[PDB]
Ligand binder design. Structure first.
Ligand SMILES: O=C(O)C1=C[C@@H](OP(=O)(O)O)[C@@H](O)[C@H](O)C1
Ligand SMILES: O=C(O)C[NH2+]CP(=O)(O)O
Length: 436
């Protein structure tokens, strides 16, 4: 039982390299596992969520050498049909991405699999993948449309045309993966574009994608071919520092080699709309993902009305963006973000609770929040076991008038194992301490 304790910052400074992208890491190892040939993955995120994906794949006979101290995986692919029936349930930990992408991969295998997870994951919604996989011919049992899931593999799935009913890159990805195993074309239409890492990695692994009028499509029966991958820094991890440097007087930092995929840039798009001073330089493209260095200096902010097209491009950054909104001049309004309620925790409820506890006038909406910019006070908040709520309030502590105690931070290692170390290195004071 560990908590974080902060004291205000006198200014962030320095150059830091954040760890690898969680979303790209999940996809890289999964596709590499079923490719033909050897894939070396550099920059792999050695956090709990990504290592749960690795262990699950190893239980099914993927050949993965984990070099944790170097953030490298060496994967010897087993080909499309090379996986083997696992002996026990696959424990996905806290990871919705893992359970949802694995379900797509496993729906068309000739064996049965049970997928489970931690107490948070077992409360999260799965009807969104069960419905369309079932249309493809899958058989997935669940009690109450939440995990645990039992997948009765069907090696004769059929492609479908599906329009996403919510802006979910996970549903899109799940269906594209099942599409690799399905007879014919699987075409996905996205009315609200979400992160496109699956599409980019499929191309990297030489799997062809086609696009028509309104959708992206894959045809089953192709072969993934091994191709070394360098994973960019996670912009979601960098976002904590981007906000901290933006709001803390005297700050100027540079974040090196961060992924800057346009479908992941919402936090920068929105902060610039608020008045932030953010420069993206040294742009490079590798393995179909763009990377760049991001330089951030303190700037005074104004409240904004957040547009809906940016919600799927900023979904995981709302916790830390709301901290920026809390110290901006004026009102910030977030609507059409009901997806926040079905994450590791209900992130709207969690952010509103913590902000009120730190003296901010924050109000919940069914699909968002309304925040009146003000002044953060010291106090005590609860992470609700959500890594991003925890890190968001650690960022709040940079500008809070007094110390901030953040309860229950043991899940920060699901996405950012060295958060505390890097935070202290740049000037945002954080101590890991024993809780109650
Ligand atoms: O596909 C992915 O890697 C992710 C998609 C998002 O979830 P949804 O697909 O539920 O929006 C995001 O919240 C998650 O952390 C990573
Ligand atoms: O990383 C985050 O902020 C949200 N993760 C959602 P999950 O991968 O567990 O579905």
């Amino acid at each position: 039982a560990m908590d974080y304790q902060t004291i205000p910052s006198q200014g962030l400074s320095g150059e830091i390299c954040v760890p690898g992208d969680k979303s790209i890491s999940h996809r890289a190892v999964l596709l590499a596992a079923i490719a033909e040939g050897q894939t070396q993955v550099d920059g792999f995120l050695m956090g709990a969520d990504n290592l749960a994906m690795v262990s699950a794949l190893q239980q099914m006979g993927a050949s993965i050498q984990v070099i944790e101290d170097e953030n490298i995986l060496v994967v010897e692919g087993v080909g499309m049909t090379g996986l083997q029936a696992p002996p026990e349930a696959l424990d996905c930990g806290n990871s919705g991405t893992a359970i949802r992408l694995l379900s797509g991969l496993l729906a068309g295998q000739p064996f049965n699999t049970v997928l489970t997870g931690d107490s948070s994951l077992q409360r999260r919604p799965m009807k969104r993948i069960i419905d369309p996989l079932t249309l493809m011919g899958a058989k997935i049992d669940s009690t109450g449309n939440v995990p645990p899931l039992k997948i009765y593999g069907n090696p004769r799935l059929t492609g479908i045309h599906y329009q996403l009913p919510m802006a979910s890159a996970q549903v899109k990805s799940c269906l594209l993966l099942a599409g690799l195993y399905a007879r014919g074309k699987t075409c996905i239409t996205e009315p609200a574009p979400s992160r496109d890492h699956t599409e980019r990695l499929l191309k990297h692994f030489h799997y062809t994608l086609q696009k028509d009028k309104q959708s992206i499509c894959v045809s089953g029966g192709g072969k993934l071919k091994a191709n070394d991958i360098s994973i960019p820094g996670d912009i979601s991890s960098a976002a904590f520092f981007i906000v901290a440097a933006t709001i803390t007087p005297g700050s100027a930092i540079r974040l090196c080699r961060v992924g800057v995929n346009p479908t992941r840039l919402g936090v920068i798009n929105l902060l610039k709309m608020m008045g932030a001073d953010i420069e993206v330089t040294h742009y490079t493209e590798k393995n179909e993902e763009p990377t760049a260095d991001i330089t951030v200096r303190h700037a005074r902010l104004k409240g904004i009305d957040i547009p809906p097209d940016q919600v799927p491009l900023t979904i995981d950054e709302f916790p830390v963006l709301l901290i920026a909104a809390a110290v901006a001049q004026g009102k910030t309004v977030l609507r059409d973000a009901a997806e926040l309620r079905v994450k590791e925790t209900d992130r709207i409820a969690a952010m509103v609770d913590g902000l009120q506890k730190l003296g901010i006038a924050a109000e919940s909406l069914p699909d968002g929040v309304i925040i009146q910019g003000g002044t953060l006070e010291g106090g005590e908040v609860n992470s609700y076991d959500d890594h991003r709520i925890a890190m968001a309030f650690a960022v709040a502590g940079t500008l809070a008038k007094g110390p901030v105690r953040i309860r229950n931070c043991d899940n920060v290692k699901t996405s950012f194992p060295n958060f505390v170390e890097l935070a202290n290195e740049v000037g945002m004071n954080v101590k890991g301490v024993r809780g109650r």
